[PDB]
Amino acid sequence: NYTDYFFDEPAFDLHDGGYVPLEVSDAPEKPLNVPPLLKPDKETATDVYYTVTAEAGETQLLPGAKTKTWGYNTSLLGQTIVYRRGQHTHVTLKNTLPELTTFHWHGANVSGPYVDGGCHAPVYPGESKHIDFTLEQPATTLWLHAHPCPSTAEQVWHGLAAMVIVKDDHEASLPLPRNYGVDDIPVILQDRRFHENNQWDYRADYDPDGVAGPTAMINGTINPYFDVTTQKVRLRFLNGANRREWRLHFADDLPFTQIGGDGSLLPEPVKFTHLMLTCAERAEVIVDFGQYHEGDEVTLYTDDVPLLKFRIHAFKPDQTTLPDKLFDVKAPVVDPALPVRHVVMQGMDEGVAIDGKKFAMQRIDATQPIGKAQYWDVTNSNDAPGMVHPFHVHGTQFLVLSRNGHAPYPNEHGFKDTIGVNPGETVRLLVRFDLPGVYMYHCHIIEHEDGGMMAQIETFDP
Amino acid sequence: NYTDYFFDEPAFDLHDGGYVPLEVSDAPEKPLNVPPLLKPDKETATDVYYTVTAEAGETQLLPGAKTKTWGYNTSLLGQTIVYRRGQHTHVTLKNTLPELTTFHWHGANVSGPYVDGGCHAPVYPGESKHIDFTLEQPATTLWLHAHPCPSTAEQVWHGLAAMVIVKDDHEASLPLPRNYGVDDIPVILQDRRFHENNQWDYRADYDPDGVAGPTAMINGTINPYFDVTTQKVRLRFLNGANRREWRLHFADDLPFTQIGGDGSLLPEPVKFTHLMLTCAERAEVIVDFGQYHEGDEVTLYTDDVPLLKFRIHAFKPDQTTLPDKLFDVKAPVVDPALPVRHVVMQGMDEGVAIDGKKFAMQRIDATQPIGKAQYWDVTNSNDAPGMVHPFHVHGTQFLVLSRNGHAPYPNEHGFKDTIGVNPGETVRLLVRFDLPGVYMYHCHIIEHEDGGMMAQIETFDP
Numbered sequence: 001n002y003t004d005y006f007f008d009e010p011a012f013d014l015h016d017g018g019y020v021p022l023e024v025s026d027a028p029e030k031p032l033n034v035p036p037l038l039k040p041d042k043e044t045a046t047d048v049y050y051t052v053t054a055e056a057g058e059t060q061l062l063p064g065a066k067t068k069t070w071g072y073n074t075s076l077l078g079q080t081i082v083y084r085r086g087q088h089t090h091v092t093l094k095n096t097l098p099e100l101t102t103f104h105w106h107g108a109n110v111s112g113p114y115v116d117g118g119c120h121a122p123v124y125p126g127e128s129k130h131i132d133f134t135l136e137q138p139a140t141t142l143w144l145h146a147h148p149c150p151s152t153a154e155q156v157w158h159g160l161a162a163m164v165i166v167k168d169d170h171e172a173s174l175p176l177p178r179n180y181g182v183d184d185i186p187v188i189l190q191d192r193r194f195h196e197n198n199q200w201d202y203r204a205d206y207d208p209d210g211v212a213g214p215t216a217m218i219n220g221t222i223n224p225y226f227d228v229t230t231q232k233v234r235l236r237f238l239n240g241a242n243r244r245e246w247r248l249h250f251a252d253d254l255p256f257t258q259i260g261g262d263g264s265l266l267p268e269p270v271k272f273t274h275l276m277l278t279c280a281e282r283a284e285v286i287v288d289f290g291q292y293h294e295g296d297e298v299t300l301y302t303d304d305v306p307l308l309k310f311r312i313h314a315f316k317p318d319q320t321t322l323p324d325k326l327f328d329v330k331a332p333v334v335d336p337a338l339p340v341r342h343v344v345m346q347g348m349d350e351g352v353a354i355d356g357k358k359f360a361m362q363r364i365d366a367t368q369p370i371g372k373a374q375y376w377d378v379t380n381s382n383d384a385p386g387m388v389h390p391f392h393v394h395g396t397q398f399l400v401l402s403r404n405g406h407a408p409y410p411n412e413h414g415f416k417d418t419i420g421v422n423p424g425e426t427v428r429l430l431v432r433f434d435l436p437g438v439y440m441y442h443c444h445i446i447e448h449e450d451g452g453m454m455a456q457i458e459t460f461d462p
Numbered sequence: 463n464y465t466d467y468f469f470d471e472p473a474f475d476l477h478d479g480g481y482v483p484l485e486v487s488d489a490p491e492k493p494l495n496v497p498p499l500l501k502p503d504k505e506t507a508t509d510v511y512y513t514v515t516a517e518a519g520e521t522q523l524l525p526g527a528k529t530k531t532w533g534y535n536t537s538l539l540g541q542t543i544v545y546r547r548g549q550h551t552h553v554t555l556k557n558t559l560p561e562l563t564t565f566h567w568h569g570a571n572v573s574g575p576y577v578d579g580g581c582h583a584p585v586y587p588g589e590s591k592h593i594d595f596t597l598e599q600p601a602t603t604l605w606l607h608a609h610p611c612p613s614t615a616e617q618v619w620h621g622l623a624a625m626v627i628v629k630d631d632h633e634a635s636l637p638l639p640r641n642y643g644v645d646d647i648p649v650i651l652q653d654r655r656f657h658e659n660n661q662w663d664y665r666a667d668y669d670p671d672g673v674a675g676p677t678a679m680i681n682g683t684i685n686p687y688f689d690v691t692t693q694k695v696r697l698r699f700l701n702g703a704n705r706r707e708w709r710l711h712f713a714d715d716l717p718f719t720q721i722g723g724d725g726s727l728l729p730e731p732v733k734f735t736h737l738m739l740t741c742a743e744r745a746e747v748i749v750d751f752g753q754y755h756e757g758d759e760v761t762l763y764t765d766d767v768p769l770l771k772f773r774i775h776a777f778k779p780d781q782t783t784l785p786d787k788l789f790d791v792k793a794p795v796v797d798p799a800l801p802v803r804h805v806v807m808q809g810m811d812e813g814v815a816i817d818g819k820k821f822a823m824q825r826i827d828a829t830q831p832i833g834k835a836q837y838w839d840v841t842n843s844n845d846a847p848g849m850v851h852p853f854h855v856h857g858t859q860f861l862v863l864s865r866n867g868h869a870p871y872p873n874e875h876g877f878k879d880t881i882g883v884n885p886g887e888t889v890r891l892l893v894r895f896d897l898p899g900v901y902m903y904h905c906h907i908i909e910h911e912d913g914g915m916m917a918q919i920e921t922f923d924p
């Protein structure tokens with residue numbers, strides 16, 4: 001028998017000796033939390049004005065005491081930020097936390113290293129920073145998380161992540177669910193461990209090879225259920241876990257279509273029974289509950305553990321069907337002057353590194369001209385047991401050309417900013433930076449990021 | 463009636479609104495810890511080798527559960543390291559902590575920014591780093607603490623601090639108590655707050671204007687006594703606190719003579735009843751116990767709170783031959799070309815800043831030519847109440863020329879690397895960097911450091 005998922009079975013997170021299985025919680029089932037859309041300060045056709053505010057607070061997650069949490073414009077996680085292609089965006093960043101944070105727009109194509117908001121973009125307590133940008137990139141699902149170096153892991157654990165939706169005119173024209181909170185919803189998959197008083201303790205739970213709690217947390221909810229009032233729903237999956245891989249699938253083996261990846265819509269829709277997500281990967285999918293009846297409760301699983309209940313209410317019949325081609329993927333041409341960059345991800349545990357060395361934040365590790373496209377060959381040097389390392393790159397949306405010289409997985413024909421690399425595997429990417437600056441590339445298992453599995457590239461203009 | 467101590471009374475830490483008084487502990491009284499000397503790996507006359515290991519551990523501090531602590535070559539604080547002027551010193555920095563740290567040699571005249579061991583000298587978990595240097599500076603009492611930016615304050619709270627003794631030919635000639643752990647003892651002065659199961663929690667106790675607990679902790683000991691077995695004892699005081707000021711004095715108003723500041727022997731000895739130490743300051747003092755007979759008991763206080771009981775036993779009579787002059791202070795001439803540098807410390811709480819801007823890792827703030835000495839005028843631009851900021855400079859011992867135009871305090875005529883600037887005060891330093899590199903200057907209230915009250919200077923060879 002085969003494995004359903006596209007990644008190499010022997011390298012799944014669950015064969016590790018440190019593996020923490022998910023347990024179903026005792027807490028009562030409650031409605032999936034849907035983060036409200038962040039009301040702009042001002043909006044016109046050309047200019048939008050937002051205030052994003054890191055803040056500390058408390059949240060009812062489990063019965064008893066409220067869990068102390070951080071979040072953007074709310075106690076935990078963050079109100080969902082909407083950006084438009086071609087719109088000039090003005091964001092006031094404001095830190096009201098006790099510690100200093102960063103504001104990373106993961107997958108956004110903005111100048112580094114201040115707008116991109118990496119290690120080099122501190123915002124001290126009490127401080128406000130004012131950034132501005134125009135996105136010239138396809139409609140997709142981004143996110144915002146903290147990125148101090150270190151500790152990105154600790155801060156993300158505390159609850160500093162938020163969904164970011166980018167819109168364009170092409171996506172608006174397709175026949176997709178788009179009614180936010182009703183048939184189009186964030187599904188931000190995370191795992192935590194609660195201690196005494198339902199409180200989190202990252203340092204108590206720390207493991208240099210990835211932190212993973214046994215209690216799953218969807219949009220900062222425990223045992224969520226979502227009431228389905230339409231035949232088709234669109235889930236925007238985001239893996240905001242520190243290490244855990246998600247092996248999503250319905251109990252029924254109900255199919256669903258993927259229409260979106262990290263960076264863009266997929267070129268063509270892809271049908272699925274099971275779907276794996278490494279860290280930071282996103283997938284937009286359409287589910288058809290047409291076969292189910294009022295009162296039926298349908299469960300989404302990961303491995304053998306239930307995640308999310310779907311309650312089926314009365315819904316009017318939906319006759320529409322998706323086009324054969326969703327999106328037109330326009331691949332740059334490789335600059336024949338530039339050679340093939342070979343990035344080598346090596347090690348696990350405390351010995352992670354990239355191309356022989358650990359992050360130094362004064363040090364430029366590589367260079368590349370803007371506007372010009374280069375082949376990257378990203379390799380995972382891990383050995384017999386190994387692990388799938390999610391490779392991420394700031395300030396770009398790349399294309400996947402090969403996996404060990406074969407075709408990329410069916411959901412990889414779009415633009416991506418994060419790709420899972422299996423042990424032994426060498427993937428070929430087509431990477432082009434549009435704006436100059438300094439960008440990191442690192443494994444997005446956030447413990448390895450902080451373990452220094454992270455280099456930075458400086459882009460210039462010739 | 464006057465104030466006994468040299469600093470401005472209205473600006474003492476105890477006038478602060480969020481002041482935490484020390485309270486005497488319930489803990490049983492017990493022998494003061496004396497950190498053992500770190501045994502060299504190998505040692506000739508011209509070369510010494512050392513291994514210093516950041517390691518995590520537990521330490522019986524109170525009866526019950528062991529307090530989880532950090533230390534260098536031990537569970538808490540650190541074994542004392544001995545360096546000798548002229549001797550080429552080799553050190554292997556081993557980090558076995560779960561977080562990344564840094565090995566700052568406070569007051570060492572060593573090249574920056576790697577050896578100096580500041581913000582730009584990270585050492586990751588499980589990683590080793592080798593460094594060499596030859597100290598070319600007077601004998602004095604230095605220390606080692608962590609200096610990752612941020613959080614310096616968290617790591618010093620966990621207990622990463624260690625006394626460092628520098629010896630030379632001149633200091634050996636003089637008649638000073640010099641039998642370590644018997645008549646020459648460290649007195650590392652710190653405070654902590656204990657929570658459930660005798661544990662520390664820095665983030666519970668966090669205050670952006672300075673953390674301070676109610677429990678005094680001398681050399682990682684609670685309610686210490688020390689058995690005196692010699693008429694003269696030498697105390698090397700170090701203020702290892704995050705924020706607290708120590709206002710030291712004995713009962714019986716027993717006098718004591720100061721022979722040593724931060725950077726050197728004092729030119730001449732200075733008698734005292736009451737000494738005030740701001741953060742990171744050191745003071746070697748001699749205490750004569752000739753008045754007292756066997757079975758007597760003298761208590762060292764801070765403000766009105768007993769720190770350390772001295773138990774007098776039988777001792778041999780001792781000469782009282784402290785010379786009139788201990789050390790000759792060779793002051794450089796300021797270079798006529800160079801201007802007066804003006805450093806302005808400003809703020810309290812979350813608004814702390816130096817010269818109108820917070821820290822920025824990859825921003826050089828100032829420059830100075832190696833070997834050439836310049837007047838620095840450091841100002842504490844604080845309001846009516848305000849507080850004393852201990853100003854500190856990596857990579858130099860400086861001299862104090864004036865306080866608001868008047869003479870510096872009696873104990874400030876030697877070399878120093880940390881000085882307390884009172885509100886509305888302008889001290890005038892004479893500063894010279896011997897080796898080139900990048901060095902920071904900051905307040906040594908460790909919370910203000912982390913709040914970005916810190917800049918950095920770059921030294922070059924012309």
Ligand SMILES: [Cu+2]
Pocket residue numbers: 104106145280392444
């Ligand atoms: Cu990210």
Ligand SMILES: [Cu+2]
Pocket residue numbers: 104105106107392393394
């Ligand atoms: Cu990113």
Ligand SMILES: [Cu+2]
Pocket residue numbers: 389390443444445448453
């Ligand atoms: Cu990794």
Ligand SMILES: [Cu+2]
Pocket residue numbers: 104118147392394440442
């Ligand atoms: Cu990143």
Ligand SMILES: [Cu+2]
Pocket residue numbers: 566568607742906
């Ligand atoms: Cu220091």
Ligand SMILES: [Cu+2]
Pocket residue numbers: 566567568569854855856
């Ligand atoms: Cu220092």
Ligand SMILES: [Cu+2]
Pocket residue numbers: 580609854856902904
């Ligand atoms: Cu420092």
Ligand SMILES: [Cu+2]
Pocket residue numbers: 814851852905906907910911915
């Ligand atoms: Cu300060």
